[PDB]
Symmetry: C2
């Protein structure tokens, strides 16, 4: 689910940032009460994404994938000229509704612009 992915992402990011994931930090990162974190952490444990709390290899794999996908979509929206202020909220929504196929094709397109700057200028010219 979207929520589960939001949690796994924030947990992975805290562990990379701090070395551990506190319930209070997850709650602060997701703007939720810790009782919701506690209840969700018990599901993630049940579904073997985690064992403070430690991500299993399964949990680590998904976390890293979600971070990559967020970063990819940010650079996609940035490349096509979306106002920087708007990018995060858009990515945070759309990330959960894109198939791997779309993600990978968005990947190729990001690569398409990056390998020749003229392409970027031509895209900019249309926006005029």
């Amino acid at each position: 689910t979207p929520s589960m992915e939001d949690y796994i992402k924030q947990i992975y990011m805290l562990i990379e940032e701090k070395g551990y994931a506190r319930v209070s930090d997850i709650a602060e990162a997701l703007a939720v009460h810790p009782s919701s974190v506690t209840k969700m952490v018990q599901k993630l444990d049940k579904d073997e994404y985690l064992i403070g709390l430690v991500l299993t290899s399964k949990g680590k794999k998904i976390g890293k994938r979600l971070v990559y996908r967020h970063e990819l979509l940010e650079q996609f929206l940035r490349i096509i000229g979306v106002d920087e202020e708007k990018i995060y909220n858009d990515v945070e929504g759309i990330e959960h509704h894109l198939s791997w196929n779309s993600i990978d094709r968005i990947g190729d397109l990001v690569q398409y612009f990056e390998e020749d700057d003229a392409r970027k200028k031509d895209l900019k010219s249309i926006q005029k």
Copy 2:
């Protein structure tokens, strides 16, 4: 809301297709129970999107924009080479989570590829 956008879009599409929007057709289009439809219909009436379901001018403007947005994003995923079978499901989800700014820039991106087929060919080459 996302749900409200789904309903307004489907109502607009039925009126364009058939000339009218019956609650039973709405229910089938969204695969929901009629009571869910009637609840949203009253909400849309209260919010002056509609009044024998008839869109007010406010309702038509939004309906037309939502149909446009859907088509645009289908075209976007299609151009970048997403498997046709996967496109509709992805668009159905992301359409609610993109700012107008993102939609406009995606519009520019679609225009970018549509105006020179060589650009499409160059993108497909990268995909190899």
